[PDB]
């Protein structure tokens, strides 16, 4: 049911996008970038501005109206923290297929309540919060990532960080490789999409021949993914997976920037996650500068280049 909506993650040229928090500083700036990148931003919403227009597009008071009036199959949220979970909740109630929440700062308690609702339905797929979004190189960009550094290709990339992911993407391009799709699931401890969600899509995507998983300390999503790959990416046709897990040098009990990047009560350590993934056949690049070269060698080794 919730797992059904996983398919919504695969944004493409036909995905139509609306922006919640459309007239704000962040939403306006990033809707400008989406438009110049080629994304299909057709409208947006802001409280009390239904009727007005912005960036040459219609603005609505509700997502229900905009979803209806514009045919949007996806929403991106730049609504400030006190109202961002409200925003996610509204797009869920309007049954927007894909909701990308960029907004950092949403109280954790707010996300736990949003999830209760989220997991008991199957229309809406949520990525975030505190995430940079999703991008199908050349077809669609939802979020704040630099589109120009991306080049359509064969590596599906899933990640808990923003800039660290761009580093990775850049590295693949410095060795002529490409990304089929990139999902920044973000740095919060409670969110709508995890690693397993993306790996599933990557494993079933013929455009994706390799996968890069970028993780860090905190939680158990990396271990869960390790578990899913042992189970599902084994066999005469498994796809190569390369990973880098940040935070090896991180001290215990401290939030390292991301609210979810914390080692507490003996859990969340980077090495346990590396070890877990290795056991699932994941080739871990010990250095964050060698993710490009590492996955190039993997293809090279399978004569996939």
């Amino acid at each position: 049911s919730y797992t059904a909506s996983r398919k919504h993650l695969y944004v493409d040229k036909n995905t139509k996008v609306i922006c919640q928090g459309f007239t704000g500083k962040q939403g306006t700036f990033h809707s400008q970038q989406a438009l110049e990148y080629g994304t299909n931003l057709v409208g947006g919403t802001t409280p009390g501005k239904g009727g007005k227009t912005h960036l040459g597009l219609p603005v609505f008071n509700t997502v229900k109206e905009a979803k209806e009036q514009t045919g949007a199959t996806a929403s991106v949220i730049y609504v400030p923290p006190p109202f961002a979970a409200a925003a996610i909740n509204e797009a869920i109630d309007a049954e927007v297929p894909l909701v990308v929440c960029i907004t950092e700062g949403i109280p954790q308690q707010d996300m736990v309540r949003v999830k209760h609702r989220l997991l008991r339905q199957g229309k809406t797929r949520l990525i975030g919060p505190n995430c940079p979004g999703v991008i199908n190189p050349g077809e669609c960009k939802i979020g704040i990532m630099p589109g120009h550094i991306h080049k359509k290709g064969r590596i599906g990339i899933v990640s808990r960080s923003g800039t660290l992911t761009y580093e990775a993407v850049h590295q693949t391009t410095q060795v002529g490789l490409g990304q089929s799709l990139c999902v920044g699931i973000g740095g919060d401890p409670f969110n709508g999409t995890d690693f397993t969600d993306c790996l599933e899509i990557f494993l079933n995507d013929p455009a994706t021949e390799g996968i890069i998983l970028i993780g860090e300390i905190g939680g158990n999503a990396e271990e869960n993914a390790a578990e899913f790959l042992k189970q599902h990416n084994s066999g005469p046709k498994s796809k190569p997976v390369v990973s880098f897990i940040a935070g090896l040098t991180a001290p215990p009990g401290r939030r390292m920037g991301h609210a979810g990047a914390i080692i507490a009560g003996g859990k969340g350590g980077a090495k346990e996650k590396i070890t877990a993934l290795q056991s699932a056949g994941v080739v871990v690049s010990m250095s964050p500068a060698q993710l490009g070269t590492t996955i190039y060698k993997e293809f090279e080794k399978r004569k996939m280049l």
Binding site: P81, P82, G105, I106, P107, Q108, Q109, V112, R113, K115, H116, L119, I144, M145, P146, H148, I149, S159, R160, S161, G162, T163, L164, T165, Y166, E167, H170, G187, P189, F190, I214, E216, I217, G218, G219, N220, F244, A246, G247, L248, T249, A250, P251, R254, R255, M256, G257, H258, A259, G260, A261, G265, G266, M286, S287, P288, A289, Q290
Partner: protein, 393 residues
């Protein structure tokens, strides 16, 4: 964000959670008077610092132990005099210890049953979780390894709330009986509701117990607050002193800079928490020792590049700086200019290795390269790291 024992015990009591009666005091006489006015058979005097381990601590006055029991109010005033204004070191504080400005004077209650009970949002469960154990008085991780069957869990439905039957079943698994079970069950509902109200990521009671006289009491407890709920938890956040925070860190926060000190000597300055951790990491992989993790955040103002730098240089232990910025949005020549402008106005005298990637990198390393300040340019992150390490060798 952290609260002193007296602050959190008050917060708890104000929300129906049973805790020991207590007075707070800033001087030894106030402590003596507190103890008298308490009018109890026995009293506990406890130094107020954030770091755990007080009981096995030592004060710079000569006094061994941060927690003491006595019936004689007189002894409380005397003991307090050896604590106030002194430093208390414990296994969890730094070398020099921590200044004690206040002590708690509370009624010491006897304990017949010690149990563990916490409420947290488990990342595995998605939703609040009630974690208890009849074996209290002990580090929870320990009981889990020793007797994992003594650990009891109740998944709470955040939308329904905790059910009476969950509080009762847990109260019974903790070991409470008769009317005490009903009391424990209630204290539990109250702890859960407090958990939701103050936006805790966790409320940990230990020991969660009972007196021979018949009361269920939260003897000690620790609460972690969710930083993202600060805009709706003003009063609680205002009670945060920060007096026990690493100095550079309070300074960095002043500018929305997320700084975490490490003990190495190569400093970092990065944008993006993941990239920050990784940079501290790659430095270590190449035989270096990072001095800190520093995530500039995103809205990088010139003033922040300035403070970010001001805070790394001011650190005596810093012998070099690795700047790793991924431009994307903004174009590097801009970034490069703010780096030069700040380093000039700061007369940065320690070597700086700068790794800039994103847009206009070439020019940006020119603008950098045109400076004559101990700035060096790196082509990639591995190069950056190797250079920063060479720098301090």
């Amino acid at each position: 964000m952290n609260l002193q024992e007296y602050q959190s015990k008050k917060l708890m009591s104000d929300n129906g959670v049973k805790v020991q009666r207590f007075f707070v005091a800033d001087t030894a006489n106030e402590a003596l008077e507190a103890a008298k006015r308490l009018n109890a058979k026995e009293i506990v005097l406890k130094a107020q610092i954030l770091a755990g381990g007080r009981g096995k601590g030592v004060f710079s006055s000569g006094l061994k132990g941060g927690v003491h029991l006595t019936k004689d109010p007189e002894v409380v005033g005397q003991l307090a005099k050896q604590m106030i204004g002194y430093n208390l070191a414990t296994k969890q504080t730094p070398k020099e210890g921590v200044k004690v400005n206040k002590v708690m004077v509370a009624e010491a209650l006897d304990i017949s049953r010690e149990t563990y009970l916490a409420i947290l949002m488990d990342r595995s469960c998605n939703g609040p979780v009630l974690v208890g154990s009849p074996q209290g008085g002990v580090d929870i991780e320990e009981v889990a390894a020793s007797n994992p069957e003594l650990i009891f869990k109740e998944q709470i439905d955040i939308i329904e709330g905790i059910k009476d039957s969950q509080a009762q079943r847990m109260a019974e698994n903790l070991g409470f009986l008769g009317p005490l079970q009903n009391q424990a069950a209630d204290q539990i509902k109250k702890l859960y509701n407090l958990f939701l109200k103050i936006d805790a990521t966790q409320v940990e009671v230990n020991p969660f117990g009972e007196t021979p006289e018949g009361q269920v009491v939260c003897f000690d407890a620790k609460i972690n607050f969710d930083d993202n709920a600060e805009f709706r938890q003003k009063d609680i956040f205002a009670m945060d002193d920060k007096s026990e925070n690493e100095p550079i860190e309070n300074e960095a926060a002043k500018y929305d800079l997320k700084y975490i000190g490490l003990d190495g000597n190569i400093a970092c300055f990065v944008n993006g928490a993941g990239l920050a951790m990784a940079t501290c990491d790659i430095i270590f992989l190449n035989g270096g020792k990072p001095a800190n993790f520093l995530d500039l955040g995103g809205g990088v103002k010139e003033s922040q590049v300035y403070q970010a730098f001001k805070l790394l240089t001011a650190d005596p232990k810093v012998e070099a700086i690795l700047v790793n910025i991924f431009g994307g949005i903004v174009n590097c020549a801009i970034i490069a200019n703010g780096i030069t402008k700040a380093c000039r106005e700061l007369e940065l005298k320690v070597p700086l290795v700068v790794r800039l990637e994103g847009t206009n990198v070439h020019e940006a390393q020119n603008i950098l390269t045109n400076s004559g300040l101990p700035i060096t340019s790196a082509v990639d992150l591995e190069d950056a790291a190797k250079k920063a390490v060479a720098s301090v060798t």
